Design a protein around this ligand. Structure first.
Ligand code: T6Q
Lengths: 299, 258
């Protein structure tokens, strides 16, 4: 019931609906409330809400934000989430001066991979991994949030919605119109996010689909049948694509060590089949000395 | 070879037990019967074909209906409202482009209002506690298909066709889990088209043998033999289509040699 919650303030908008910070008056628990109005529907309960709730109820993991409850008021649906203090995007911006300490970048990536491997193991694609949807707390945890664009997949996959993933974090196979995409698209997003944590700027900040592809191409080289069998047969591939040489990863993210570059290269493999799985990535030498330190800044 | 394929199979095996309807609910429904349910599911098949919905959507809807009826008594006049809301929810969950609500209202030939269909949607969600990601016969089939050598369209289509037939008849199919019905369906399809049997590799993956599939298989074989005489024919009509390789035109085996 909403009567037990005292609202503290409006946090912002999710992928769908409006988010508030609130406090459970009886237990003291601080929560985030996602309000989805049904009065403007018209079409009943939005598919995005149906998926978010059904999928999140199954996914209990320390690196996936916890859905605590779902409350139906007269004309409203309230999703009650555990509260986290900040999103990764704002944290990176705050870290403009000092940068983010390696152990923290490493801890976050390690945690993100755990969260994602759990989603994939439970047949869920997130499909919108970007720093804005990755939430951190004062204890050093980071968690996947906003499953408004997620969906349950099958083995093997069939064609799903084409318009997925925020552009900057969108995999080449989506950009090229592949009839099938799968768990690899979330790994691509995490790779972009890995790079972004190191530089604190988006790896591939396109402003259109073709601009996005060319940025990828100019960095990783224009893919051919050797690196990515089937690429020239893809629905939106064009023989006129400029052919850029691939550049050393040492130049893509100069601060990164050999282990980090190795891992990043595997997360950004053109061929979805060769691209590393979140599960396999957990055992990458990059994480041999991983710990879980608190953020270096007050949140 | 899609990764997580084993993790996912294991997880679906766990979830299907948790998503299972009460096997004996129909006897506890004072005003509805197996025959009424068959008529409803056969109608949903038609709806699915009309709006070119995925088979997965159909299977999910039937799962929602059976679970709903496992806990809510329903008068016959409202059965179709339950089914309609279920198909709408399945579509929203599963389709890239679900039909609009007005379309679901329209297909009930104006038996119910948009208001009713939307309120029922809400009730269905509450009754299922929003747990909509149910394992289906379809989901297990598409996994089993990966074990063909080589892949065969007729086999795949015939398996889906048989799995779909089981949706219609609560007696006896409410008694079998999706993974088991899918097992019987895959074997039956394989044996019909190619002469082959439940492969060693699926015994390793599932723990099921022909022996453990036998009871469901005996049922499905009978359902298959009698399909042309079944009161409900929408699935047979559907599977005459070149889309499903006209597998409903295939002749069922006279014996299985169990
Ligand atoms: C991106 N879509 C989202 N949906 C939900 C439900 C989110 C969510 N958000 C939080 N807390 C949060 C998230 C992002 C930024 C912040 N900031 C911004 C100002 C507000 N703030 C205070 C103390 O007033 C904290 C700092 C907070 N927690 C859980 C979820 C979830 N699920 S994000």
């Amino acid at each position: 019931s909403m009567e037990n919650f005292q609202k503290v303030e409006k946090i912002g908008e999710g992928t769908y609906g409006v988010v508030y910070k609130a406090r459970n008056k009886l237990t003291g628990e601080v929560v985030a409330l996602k309000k989805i109005r049904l009065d403007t529907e018209t079409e009943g309960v939005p598919s995005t809400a149906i998926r978010e709730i059904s999928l999140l109820k199954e996914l209990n993991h320390p690196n996936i934000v916890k859905l605590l409850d779902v409350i139906h008021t007269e004309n409203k649906l309230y999703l009650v989430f555990e509260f986290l203090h900040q999103d990764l995007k704002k944290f990176m911006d705050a870290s403009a001066l000092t940068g983010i300490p390696l152990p923290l970048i490493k801890s976050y990536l390690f945690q993100l991979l755990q969260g994602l491997a759990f989603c994939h193991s439970h047949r869920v694609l997130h499909r919108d991994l970007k720093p804005q949807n990755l939430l951190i707390n004062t204890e050093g945890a980071i968690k996947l949030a906003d499953f408004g664009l997620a969906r349950a997949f099958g083995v093997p996959v069939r064609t799903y919605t084409h318009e997925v993933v925020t552009l900057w974090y969108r995999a080449p196979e989506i950009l090229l119109g592949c009839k099938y995409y799968s768990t690899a698209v979330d790994i691509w997003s995490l790779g972009c996010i890995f790079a972004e944590m190191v530089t604190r700027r988006a790896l591939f900040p396109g402003d259109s689909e073709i601009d996005q592809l060319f940025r990828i191409f100019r960095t990783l080289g224009t893919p051919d049948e050797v690196v990515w069998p089937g690429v020239t047969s893809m629905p939106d591939y064009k023989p006129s694509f400029p052919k850029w040489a691939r550049q050393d990863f040492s130049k893509v993210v100069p601060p990164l060590d050999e282990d980090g570059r190795s891992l990043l290269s595997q997360m950004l493999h053109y061929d979805p089949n060769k691209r590393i799985s979140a599960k396999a990535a957990l055992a990458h030498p990059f994480f041999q000395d991983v710990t879980k330190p608190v953020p270096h800044l007050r949140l | 070879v899609p990764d997580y394929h084993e993790d996912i199979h294991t997880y679906l095996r766990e979830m299907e037990v948790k998503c299972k309807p009460k096997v004996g609910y129909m006897k506890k429904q004072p005003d509805i019967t197996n025959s009424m349910r068959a008529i409803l599911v056969d109608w949903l098949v038609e709806v699915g074909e009309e709006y070119k919905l995925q088979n997965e959507t159909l299977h999910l809807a039937v799962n929602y209906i059976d679970r709903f009826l496992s806990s809510m008594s329903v008068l016959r006049g409202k059965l179709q409202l339950v089914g309609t809301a279920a198909m709408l929810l399945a579509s929203k969950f599963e389709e890239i482009y679900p039909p609009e609500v007005a379309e679901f209202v329209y297909i009930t030939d104006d038996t119910y209002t948009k208001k009713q269909v939307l309120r029922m949607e809400h009730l269905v969600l509450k009754v299922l506690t929003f747990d909509l990601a149910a394992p289906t016969v379809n989901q297990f089939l598409t996994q089993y298909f990966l074990h063909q050598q080589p892949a065969n369209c007729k086999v795949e289509s015939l398996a889906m066709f048989l799995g779909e037939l089981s949706l219609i008849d609560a007696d006896p199919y409410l008694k079998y889990l999706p993974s088991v019905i899918a097992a019987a369906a895959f074997h039956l399809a394989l044996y019909t088209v190619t002469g082959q049997s439940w492969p060693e590799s699926l015994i390793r993956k599932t723990g099921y043998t022909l022996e453990s599939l036998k009871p469901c298989l005996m049922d499905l074989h009978q359902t298959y033999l009698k399909a042309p005489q079944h009161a409900q024919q929408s699935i047979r009509e559907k599977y005459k289509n070149s889309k499903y390789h006209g597998v409903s035109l295939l002749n069922p085996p006279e014996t299985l040699n169990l």
